[PDB]
């Protein structure tokens, strides 16, 4: 179908592809001469013909791959129909001919690029696919399923009564490959098509599940694991599809995991399938107690699979304190029980867990005593809600094992004590320190093996983190004397841990550590003056100690310590310890650090200026790059993540330096702003970099301010790029930071910091964020969002901040988004309602009584919201009613006092932590109506005190100050009057010196002192500094 002149040219080019001189003369010719609007048709026709008919493996394979790549970007839509027909028929004829397996796979991928909505129907393929699925050649059946995987719309095109038995045949096919293909294509259907199409194939799930036992019979464990991996994807998509046969799939995975003659992939995948149900259908897992029973049982079984053919754990005692990467099932079981526990809670999991725990701790199989410990460790956080009250029993179980004959069981017991010290904190620190500390300290002796000593030491880090200095003080000497011994170990990882443990004990001990400084600091210096990590940890310990004891004590060794830092710095995990130590020294020395900036900042400036580092890569070289954790890929794009992670790290340090040194950091602000902060916003392939750039902007500005054309110019530049990001930023979480960064920027720059160009572009940004938020939330048979509540919470802030800096002028610009706002107000979902209510509350403050245009548009919805079951909605509503009578008295007269009845009702589970906030706003709103325009004033009084909402408390008490300066004055409510004030002051909600001498006037008209006989010593001393 091609001129022989063209064939030989292109054949030379494609053959040239596998050979650099001959090679890229060819791909330059391909890229510049043949991928053109005049040659693309010829080029596609050629490659299709080569892949279909060439008997050279290489050329056929290459052409099929090239065709796939090129058919996309042409795109196939703009190809003349008569060549598309030519390309289709030849690909199809090549597919139905005699080809190698891999080539038919590539033919399949090529064919798939010739199927589309846009494109003319291709009934020849559909007919070809159906006859191919019935073939005796597995590769024909496999390739057909593969095509249906790429283009699952085709499953719709075929008559249902043909496609269904095809899949049922596929699930039970004699070939493993075909089966895996069938399962992949089946799940792929749900991956690509709308949910309204799912019920067409959903009925095939029991057929699939019934096919699974066959894999165990044939001993096909790896094919089973592949099928599990597809089923796991299906559980994330349509968990409820598994409802009716939940028991059998639960019992099947149980059966697979218990069969420990199988290779790990079958059993780890099986466990993941179990696990994933808890993450996608928890109500379903909870409604069936056979699930939890099975999940607990099998994870426990797998956690016993440690130190196989090594009962002494000799290999474990001799190795360092890292994980054995070979104990795969053990590790998988730990993470699994953790994930499920976090999803289902202790009310469901604790009982079946402890049924086994009771039993396993007593076994002679040390591996089961070990496994019991690790299992409790994994489930503790997620079962915390329950286990936090069963804490002496847990310790009664665990603590006796701390001297188990087997050192790996001891280790396990140290693990639990450490783990629950985190998960049950701070309550376990306050109530079990007399048991946990002596148990851990006892394992520090050189009687125990290195591994147990070290892990006991690690557990002490966990405990310390939430133990107050007063709790630790009587244990400090014992702790340290022991740790000093660990410090003299010949085993490096023991020393390293000892240092870290001392450090974080010191951090918790604070000024209680001062008496230990003299004994420790020399031992540290000797370590440093002599193994990179050791020094890094030793430098960390030294500076954490320094921060604990304070500047004065630290000054005894600071300059020597600094000189050693300098030596270490200018001589990869070490660099992180050093950077953090520098930053901690800055916290300690305060302003005295400033001469050290020329040493500390330039390394950071380099790392923080890192460019995004991205190489656009081919689809084959895609996974190839992602083996390494420091690289990720998402045309295809290879990003170097760690380089950008370190970019964020450096920016975070620059942040803290800027924050600590304030004005002393001004000299860097311009550079950091223009070269680092602002460019970071354009980093569209790394979320963290963008957020770090944003948070940096207000803190940079405050530095320069504290120490002007520069300041104003940089703010104009930074605000504009922030504002400009609101309409481009796809990530809602990042969007929130931008608004928050604008609030703080505005707060720094002050009054009228925005031009009305910016005020306009800000409004377009807000509307775009609101529009996209609405659509994302406007979205069951198959299935059972705080990120967006938070975004809307800061949009409230920025609008409020912008209103304040414009001193009202932004009312004009906000007019254009009220239809958006109004939609939100009436909407079902409380999140959108709360947002709107807060906005309207801010509007009236600057737009009362400018808002008569809006009055009857929101008040009908506001008055409903008053009685709403959601406290958040009542509060925001009560506030609006209140601010109506405060800033727009006469425009809202006909509304405020009719609602004065409802406020008196809502005002009375009201005085309770959950809704204490809501009822104080209503209390405030009542006080506002009473002020603006009399049984109500006495009703409002016993809503006092106001102790949570500060804005609300502020008004209520100088309404109280003005009511006197009737029912409040004289009388015998004088003890309730005073106490109403004392409570607000003491609770730090009340601004009140207005009211204090209003009270002092009343006490003069009397018995005066006896009113304070109620209050204890600590509150009385505050009273005396008050009156």
């Amino acid at each position: 179908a091609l001129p022989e002149e063209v064939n030989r040219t292109l054949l030379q080019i494609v053959q040239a592809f596998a050979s650099n001189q001959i090679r890229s003369v060819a791909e330059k010719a391909l890229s510049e001469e043949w991928i053109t609007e005049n040659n693309i048709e010829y080029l596609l026709t050629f490659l299709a013909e080569q892949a279909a008919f060439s008997q050279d493996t290489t050329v056929a394979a290459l052409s099929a791959v090239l065709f796939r790549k090129l058919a996309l970007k042409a795109p196939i839509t703009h190809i003349r129909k008569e060549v598309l027909a030519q390309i289709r028929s030849s690909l199809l004829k090549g597919f139905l001919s005699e080809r190698a397996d891999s080539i038919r796979h590539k033919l399949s991928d090529a064919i798939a690029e010739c199927v589309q909505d846009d494109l003319p129907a291709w009934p020849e393929l559909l007919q070809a696919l159906i006859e191919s699925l019935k073939s005796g050649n597995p590769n024909f059946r496999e390739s057909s399923f593969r095509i249906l995987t790429t283009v699952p719309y085709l499953i719709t095109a075929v008559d249902i009564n043909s496609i269904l038995p095809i899949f049922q045949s596929g699930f039970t096919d004699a070939s493993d490959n075909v089966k895996i293909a069938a399962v992949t294509a089946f799940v792929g259907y749900f991956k690509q098509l709308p949910k309204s199409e799912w019920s067409k194939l959903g009925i095939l799930l029991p057929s699939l599940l019934n096919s699974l036992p066959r894999f165990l019979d044939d001993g096909k464990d790896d094919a089973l694991a592949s099928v599990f991996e597809s089923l796991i994807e299906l559980v994330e998509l349509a968990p409820k599809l598994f409802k009716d046969m939940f028991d059998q799939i639960i019992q099947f995975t149980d059966m697979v995991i218990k069969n420990k003659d199988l290779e790990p992939p079958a059993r780890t995948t099986a466990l993941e399938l179990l696990t994933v149900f808890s993450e996608n259908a928890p109500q379903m897992c909870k409604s069936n107690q056979n699930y939890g029973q099975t999940l607990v049982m099998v994870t426990l079984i797998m956690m016993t699979e440690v130190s196989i053919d090594d009962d002494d754990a000799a290999e474990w005692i001799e190795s360092d304190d890292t994980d054995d990467e070979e104990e795969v099932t053990y590790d998988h079981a730990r993470q699994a029980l953790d994930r499920v526990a976090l999803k289902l809670g202790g009310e469901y999991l604790a009982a079946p867990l402890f049924q086994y725990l009771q039993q396993m701790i007593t076994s002679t199989e040390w591996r089961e005593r070990f496994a019991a410990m690790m299992a409790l460790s994994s489930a503790a956080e997620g079962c915390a809600d329950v286990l936090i009250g069963e804490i002496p029993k847990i310790l009664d179980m665990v603590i006796p094992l701390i001297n188990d004959p087997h050192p790996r069981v001891q280790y396990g017991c140290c693990n639990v004590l450490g783990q629950i010290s985190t998960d049950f904190s701070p309550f376990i620190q306050r109530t079990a320190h007399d048991r946990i500390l002596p148990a851990l300290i006892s394992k520090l002796t050189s009687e125990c093996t290195s591994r147990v000593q070290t892990h006991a030491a690690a557990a002490l880090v966990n405990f310390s983190e939430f133990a107050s200095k007063d709790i630790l003080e009587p244990y400090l000497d014992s702790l340290l004397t022991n740790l000093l011994v660990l410090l003299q170990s010949n085993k490096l990882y023991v020393q390293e841990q000892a240092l870290t443990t001392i450090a974080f004990i010191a951090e918790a001990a604070k000024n209680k550590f001062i008496k230990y400084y003299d004994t420790l600091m020399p031992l540290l210096l000797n370590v440093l003056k002599v193994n990179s990590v050791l020094k890094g940890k030793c430098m960390e310990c030294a500076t954490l100690i320094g921060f604990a004891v304070g500047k004065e004590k630290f000054h005894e060794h600071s300059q020597e310590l600094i000189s050693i830092l300098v030596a270490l710095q200018n001589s990869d995990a070490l660099r992180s310890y050093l950077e953090q130590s520098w930053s901690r020294i800055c916290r300690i020395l305060g302003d005295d650090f400033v001469p050290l900036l020329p040493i500390v900042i330039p390394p950071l400036l380099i790392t923080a200026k890192a460019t995004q580092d991205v190489g656009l890569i081919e689809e084959e070289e895609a996974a190839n790059f992602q083996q390494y954790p420091d690289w990720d890929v998402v045309k295809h794009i290879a990003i170097h993540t760690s380089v950008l992670d370190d970019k964020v790290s450096a920016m975070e340090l620059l942040q803290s330096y800027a924050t600590l040194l304030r004005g002393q950091f001004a000299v860097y602000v311009k550079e950091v702003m223009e070269e680092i902060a602002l460019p970071s916003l354009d980093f569209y392939l790394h979320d963290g970099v963008r957020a770090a750039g944003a948070t940096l902007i207000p803190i940079l500005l405050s530095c320069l301010l504290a120490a002007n054309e520069e300041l104003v110019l940089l703010w104009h530049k930074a605000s504009s790029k922030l504002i400009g990001g609101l309409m481009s930023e796809p990530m809602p979480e990042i969007t929130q930071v931008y608004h928050n960064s604008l609030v703080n920027g505005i707060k720094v720059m002050g009054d009228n910091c925005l031009s009305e160009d910016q005020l306009a572009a800000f409004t377009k940004g807000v509307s775009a964020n609101l529009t996209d938020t609405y659509e994302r939330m406007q979205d069951d048979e198959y299935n059972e969002d705080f990120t967006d509540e938070d975004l809307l919470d800061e949009i409230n802030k920025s609008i409020a901040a912008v209103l304040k800096t414009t001193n009202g002028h932004y009312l004009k610009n906000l007019e254009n988004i009220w239809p958006m706002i109004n939609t939100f107000l009436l909407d079902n979902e409380p999140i959108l309602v709360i947002f709107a209510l807060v906005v309207i509350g801010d509007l009236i403050q600057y737009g009362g009584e400018q808002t008569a245009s809006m009055k009857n548009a929101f008040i009908p919805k506001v008055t409903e919201c008053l009685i709403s079951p959601d406290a958040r909605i009542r509060q925001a509503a009560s506030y609006i009613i209140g601010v109506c009578a405060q800033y727009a008295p006469s425009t809202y007269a006909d509304v405020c006092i009719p609602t004065l009845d409802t406020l008196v009702q809502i005002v009375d589970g009201s005085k309770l932590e959950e809704n204490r906030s809501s009822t104080e706003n209503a209390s405030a709103a009542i006080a506002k109506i009473l002020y603006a325009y009399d049984t109500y004033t006495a009703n409002w009084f016993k809503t006092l005190p106001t102790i949570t909402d500060k804005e609300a408390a502020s008004f209520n008490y100088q309404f109280l100050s003005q009511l006197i300066e009737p029912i409040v004055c004289a009388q015998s409510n004088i003890s309730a009057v005073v106490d109403s004030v004392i409570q607000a002051l003491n609770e730090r909600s009340l601004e009140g010196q207005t009211v204090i001498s209003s009270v002092k006037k009343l006490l003069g008209f009397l018995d005066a002192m006896a009113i304070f006989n109620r209050y204890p010593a600590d509150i009385m001393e505050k009273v005396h500094k008050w009156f």
Partner: peptide
Amino acid sequence: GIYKK
């Protein structure tokens, strides 16, 4: 210290 994987 002690963490979960």
